[PDB]
Structure 1
Amino acid sequence: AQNPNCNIMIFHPTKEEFNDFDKYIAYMESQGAHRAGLAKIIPPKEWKARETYDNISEILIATPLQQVASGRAGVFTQYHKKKKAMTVGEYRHLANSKKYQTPPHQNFEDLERKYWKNRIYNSPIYGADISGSLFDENTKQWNLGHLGTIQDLLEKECGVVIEGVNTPYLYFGMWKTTFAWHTEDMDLYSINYLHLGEPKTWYVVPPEHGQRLERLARELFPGSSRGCGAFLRHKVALISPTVLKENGIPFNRITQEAGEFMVTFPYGYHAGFNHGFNCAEAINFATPRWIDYGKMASQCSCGEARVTFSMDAFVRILQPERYDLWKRGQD
């Protein structure tokens, strides 16, 4: 078996290898990349997402989210307080202000230490799931707005035609902005391109060990667990690498820099934080190997998760027994 220790693998495709997206995902899996839950892909030197980022300041962040923490430094939840709209130019200025800017630090490891020591005592503001794309329409390789759709994948694999669309989302971040422990809707893949700015640090649990993380989360967030059998779907729980190590949870970490792609694999739990002002673009996708994960994916039915239009069809076709109870939750 390839990659038996479930290490995060880093790939350097040539420009020729960068033409066929599906083929390269399959290649990465042939080398065991999916066992980690997360892979990094560094594009060939001849590639670019777009010409410049000099003209993005007028993009609107309609609902910036202030991420307010509760708990202890290594085990906390965050809730999202809605703030007034602001442009990306205004957001960048805010990110760089004395209140929100990245502190002096020696290296990525020093900054990681500072993040887990001090995150809960601040409430950074995140620009989240803004529908849109920053890939140039003429970028033909690994353009996240031009991928094959999940609906077409399901149709190709299972012969059923369904409603729904899937399109990319933009994320404008600042120091300490945080993504909570989660897998994707319907345990799909995700792909994330860091367009511009400071790094993003990722933590990931191998898919074969996801239930170990779930068990620890139930122990650490007992009220939340009683309220919902899939409460990590709420995407509000954080557990530090120190606490994961203390509890013997297998995981890995890596830092993504501007110009790099990350792929998360089905049922790969991930969490992380931004180092400073940045902009990322992400979208979910599927492959034939995803279908079995989609069939088995947990669901939130307590009503908290609240999810996209397109997920209806996924649950309806892949999980017909669960569908009625689940749809009761979306209402």
Structure 2
Amino acid sequence: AQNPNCNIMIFHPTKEEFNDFDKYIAYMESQGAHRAGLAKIIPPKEWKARETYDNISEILIATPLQQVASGRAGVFTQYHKKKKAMTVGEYRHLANSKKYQTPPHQNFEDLERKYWKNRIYNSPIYGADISGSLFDENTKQWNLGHLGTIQDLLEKECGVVIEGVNTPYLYFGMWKTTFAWHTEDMDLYSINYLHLGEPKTWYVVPPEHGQRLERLARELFPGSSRGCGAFLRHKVALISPTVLKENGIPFNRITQEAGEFMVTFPYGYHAGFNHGFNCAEAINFATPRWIDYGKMASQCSCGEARVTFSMDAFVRILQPERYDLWKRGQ
């Protein structure tokens, strides 16, 4: 078995290897990459996502979110308080202000220490799930706006016909901006490109051990768990590496820098934080290997996880027994 210890693997495709997205995903899996739940892809040096990021300040963040924590430093939930709209230009200036700027630090280890020590005592702002793309239309390889859709994969594998069209989204982050422990909707893959700015640190649990994380989360957030078995789909819960180690949860960590892709694999739980102002782009995608994860994916039916109407047909086709209950929660 390839990659038995479930280490996060890093790939350096050549230009020729970068010309067929699904073929290269399959190659990474032939090397065991998916056993970690996350992989890093460094594009060939000749490739470029966009020629220049001039005028990115003109993008609108219609509903910036302030991430307010409750709990202890290593075990906390966050809720989002909505803020007034601001442009990326205004957001970047706020990120670099004295209140929000990255602190002096010796190296990544030091910064990660300061994050887990101090995150709960600040409430950073960020811009999430903004439909859009920053790839140049003439970037032809690994352009997240020109991938095959999840609907076309499902139609091809199952011979069904469904509505829906999935598109990429943008994220704007600052120091301490946080993504909570989750897997993707329907346990799909995701791909994330860091366009611009400071790094993003990721934590991941191997798919073969995701239920261990679920059981710990239920123990650590009892009230949250009671309302909904699938409450990690609410994207609210954080658990530090120190607490994971203390409870024997297997995980790994890696830092993504600008110009690098990260892929998450089906049922790979992930979480992380931003080092400073940055801009990323992400989309979900599917392969033939995903179909059996989609059929088994847990669902939130309590109401809290709102998800846009692409997901209806996925529940309807793959999980018809669960559909009426899921639909009631919507």
TM-score, reference length from structure 1? 0.99
Distance 1:124 1:205 in 2: 25
Structure 1 runs not aligned, ≥5 long:
none
Deviation string, structure 1 residues 281-300 (Cα, Å, up to 9, x no partner): 00000000000000000000
Deviation string, structure 1 residues 155-197 (Cα, Å, up to 9, x no partner): 1101001100100000000000000000000000000000000
Distance 2:122 2:328 in 1: 36
Match of 2:285 in 1: 285
The structural deviation recorded for 1:33 is 0.2
The structural deviation recorded for 1:325 is 0.1
Distance 2:91 2:310 in 1: 30
Distance 1:55 1:107 in 2: 31
Distance 2:227 2:103 in 1: 38
Distance 2:65 2:41 in 1: 29
Distance 1:158 1:109 in 2: 46
Match of 1:44 in 2: 44
Distance 1:56 1:225 in 2: 40
Match of 1:78 in 2: 78
Distance 2:53 2:117 in 1: 33
The structural deviation recorded for 1:55 is 1.6
The structural deviation recorded for 1:54 is 1.4
- 3-state DSSP of counterpart to 1:215: helix
- 3-state DSSP of counterpart to 1:57: helix
The structural deviation recorded for 1:123 is 0.2
Deviation string, structure 1 residues 223-251 (Cα, Å, up to 9, x no partner): 11110010000000000000000000000
The structural deviation recorded for 1:75 is 0.1
Deviation string, structure 1 residues 49-97 (Cα, Å, up to 9, x no partner): 0101112110000000000000000000000000000000000000000
The structural deviation recorded for 1:308 is 1.0
Displaced runs of 4 or more, over 4 A: none
- 3-state DSSP of counterpart to 2:39: strand
Distance 1:245 1:7 in 2: 16
Distance 1:186 1:308 in 2: 12
- 3-state DSSP of counterpart to 2:229: coil
Distance 1:58 1:174 in 2: 18
Distance 1:8 1:198 in 2: 21
Deviation string, structure 1 residues 276-319 (Cα, Å, up to 9, x no partner): 00000000000000000000000000000011100000000000
The structural deviation recorded for 1:48 is 0.2
Distance 2:258 2:307 in 1: 29
- Please report the RMSD computed on the Cα atoms of aligned residues, expressed in angstroms: 0.3
Distance 1:68 1:222 in 2: 19
1:70-219 paired onto structure 2 within 5 Å: 70-219=70-219
- 3-state DSSP of counterpart to 1:289: helix
- 3-state DSSP of counterpart to 2:57: coil
Distance 1:61 1:226 in 2: 34
Distance 2:72 2:100 in 1: 21
Structure 2 runs not aligned, ≥5 long:
none
The structural deviation recorded for 1:32 is 0.2
Alignment size in residue pairs:
330
Distance 1:14 1:76 in 2: 42
Distance 2:4 2:308 in 1: 35
The structural deviation recorded for 1:135 is 0.2
Deviation string, structure 1 residues 188-235 (Cα, Å, up to 9, x no partner): 000000000000000000000000000000000001111001000000
- 3-state DSSP of counterpart to 2:225: helix
Distance 2:290 2:168 in 1: 19
